[PDB]
């Protein structure tokens, strides 16, 4: 749990982070989908408990630079992310 792992639940493959889930879907319900119709909540076959699936931390990276004619130092901008989490 709590890290970027490749998982396979009853032939359902994926990659992400499995975390404890506070969702409370009824005992008969097995899977959990979302607004985009993707499985984000699952239940372990061995032990009947709820897990939330979150995609691993991704983001966009861009480079600030002056022209190479005058210098070659660069800076890095990580779009839309707090850098205490990189």
């Amino acid at each position: 749990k709590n890290k970027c792992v490749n998982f396979n639940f009853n032939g359902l493959k994926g990659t992400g982070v499995l975390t404890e889930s506070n969702k409370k879907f009824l005992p008969f319900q097995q899977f959990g989908r979302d607004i985009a119709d993707t499985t984000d909540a699952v239940r372990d076959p061995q032990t009947l408990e709820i897990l939330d699936i979150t995609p691993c931390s991704f983001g966009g990276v861009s480079v600030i630079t002056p022209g190479t004619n005058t210098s070659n130092q660069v800076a890095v901008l990580y779009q839309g992310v707090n850098c205490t989490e990189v």
Binding site: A36, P55, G60, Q79, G80
Partner: peptide, 24 residues
């Protein structure tokens, strides 16, 4: 006041260069 969401698919919204305070 008269004028008024989590997409992992890869769609992002970039902030504008000019903040509302500068426009004001």
């Amino acid at each position: 006041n008269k004028v008024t969401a989590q997409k992992f698919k890869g769609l992002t919204v970039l902030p504008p260069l000019l903040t509302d305070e500068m426009i004001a």
